Each structure stands twice: as structure tokens, then as C-alpha cells.
Design a protein around this ligand. Structure first.
Ligand SMILES: O=C1Cc2cc(Nc3nc(Cl)ncc3Br)ccc2N1
Ligand SMILES: O=C1Cc2cc(Nc3nc(Cl)ncc3Br)ccc2N1
Ligand SMILES: [Cl-]
Ligand SMILES: [Cl-]
Lengths: 4, 124, 124, 4
């Protein structure tokens, strides 16, 4: 999971 | 927004759609290319091809279970492109590049047409 | 093999499937969550959820145009997860995390359940 | 396009  | 994103989600979705294709699950159309038949999901074809997008948004053709391609289309070129739609991988070879490029132009698959043109330009 | 790969293909496919969803094109099922209704593509639901995969591979349920979820399921939690299926983006907030995690467990969406558990553990 |  990432900060888009 | 303040959303988080799962990097591998799109790839995992496509992998599963290809698994459904391999087991012939919920396929809703047959694409006829001369003597060959290819089963697929209308939604995946529309998502990958400007031609299928135009076909399945037509109020009459959206309901067809069989689509016949132009007789000039090569079944192997179509097969290579159908595999690319469901996997992101393109089996581009010296022996098939002309048929693949012609099929991608007909199907309106701009990124495939672009790499074919570049690979052909490198060999001249 | 000797294939080449188009990095953005899977993301572009999912973006187009979400565009079809937004315009209600070729949606083939209604998911009922209490008083709310959500239109979707069976194939996308199966590709994202262990529960929908089990439902639409059943010889009788594969043909249903309406699926009713358990009354304990929160429509907002479902909506957030449906958006995630079609976009890879999850709108996880302090106010919705419990409903989202419960819905993801019911839908069998393992990666969503995992991030919810980690975000909850960080706040305790 | 890349070599996968
Ligand atoms: O080279 C390409 C690939 C492609 C795909 C689609 N498909 C869709 N396009 C849009 Cl805008 N909305 C929903 C869908 Br499905 C249209 C055109 C093209 N040209
Ligand atoms: O957390 C998750 C997400 C998910 C998706 C599917 N979907 C499919 N799985 C397989 Cl193996 N083949 C085709 C399809 Br469609 C099955 C289980 C799960 N569990
Ligand atoms: Cl393309
Ligand atoms: Cl997930």
C-alpha cells in the first residue's frame, strides 16, 4: 500500500 | 482525496480475468477470425481495443454473441493480441511483427501499433 | 518466453472498466445492500473478491441478475470497497475503518483486511 | 515497454  | 493505493491491484485483477478466460468462465462472445474462434469477455475487449469499444457500445451489436472480423485479419496476429489484452505481455517476433501490427491497427490498439513501428524502424 | 511488457496496461484496463461502470455499460448484476443497490460487472467482482468468485462460479447463482448481501453489511463500507475494486484506491478513514474491515472480511478481500488490521493496530 |  502507498500514498498515490 | 486521502485514499491509500494497493500497487499490485490492477495486475492481480488482470491475472484473475485471464484465469477466468483460461477456464472459459463468464466469457460472453466468440470472435471469429477466418477458420478460428476465440472466446473472450466483451468488457476486457472494450477496455483494450478502440474497435471493440465501438462495437459493443452499439445498441444492436452489444447483444451479439458472435463477431466476425475482416477476412484479411490473421488468426495468429489476433491470438497474440488477445493474449496481450489479458496479460500485458506481447509475443513480438520477426516472423509475426507485420501481422501483429496490421491486426493492432485494425483493432485500434495504439500502444501496440507504436512499439511495432519502432521495432520495424530499428531493423531497416 | 521472449515477450515484451507494457507497464501501464493493467492500470489502463482497470481505468477503462471503471469508465464502463460510471456510464453503466455492460453491467450485468445488481448487488443489494439493505436499501441500496450497486450495479457492477460480475467478472470484476470475481477478480477482486473470494465471495463473488464463489457466487458466480456456482452453476445456479452464475445466472442471477440480483445478489442480496447479508443484512449486517453496511452500504457505505460496500461502496468504498466497490470503488477500490475498480480503482485500486481505498478511502480508509477513522469513521469508516471498522465497517470497511468487516465488509472486506465478508467479501474475502485479503489485502484490504490486512491494511485495516495494521491501521487499527497503529491507533491502539 | 520493458523486458519483464
Ligand atoms: O488504443 C486504444 C485502446 C482503447 C480502449 C478504449 N476503451 C474505452 N475507452 C474509453 Cl474512453 N472508455 C471506456 C473504454 Br472500455 C477506447 C479506445 C482505445 N484505443
Ligand atoms: O482476497 C481475495 C481476492 C480473490 C479473488 C478471487 N478470484 C479469482 N481467483 C482465482 Cl484463483 N481465479 C479466478 C478468480 Br476471478 C478468488 C479469491 C480471492 N481472495
Ligand atoms: Cl495497446
Ligand atoms: Cl484485496
Amino acid at each position: 500500500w502507498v500514498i498515490p | 482525496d486521502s485514499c491509500i493505493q494497493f500497487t499490485r491491484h490492477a495486475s492481480d485483477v488482470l491475472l484473475n480475468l485471464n484465469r477466468l478466460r483460461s477456464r472459459d468462465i463468464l466469457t460472453d462472445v466468440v470472435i471469429v477470425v477466418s477458420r478460428e474462434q476465440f472466446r473472450a469477455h466483451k468488457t476486457v475487449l472494450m477496455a483494450c481495443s478502440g474497435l471493440f469499444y465501438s462495437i459493443f457500445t452499439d445498441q444492436l451489436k452489444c447483444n451479439l454473441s458472435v463477431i466476425n472480423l475482416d477476412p484479411e485479419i490473421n488468426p495468429e496476429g489476433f491470438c497474440i493480441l488477445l493474449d496481450f489484452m489479458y496479460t500485458s505481455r506481447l509475443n513480438l517476433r520477426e516472423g509475426n511483427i507485420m501481422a501483429v501490427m496490421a491486426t493492432a491497427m485494425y483493432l485500434q490498439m495504439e500502444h501496440v501499433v507504436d512499439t511495432c513501428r519502432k521495432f520495424i524502424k530499428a531493423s531497416e
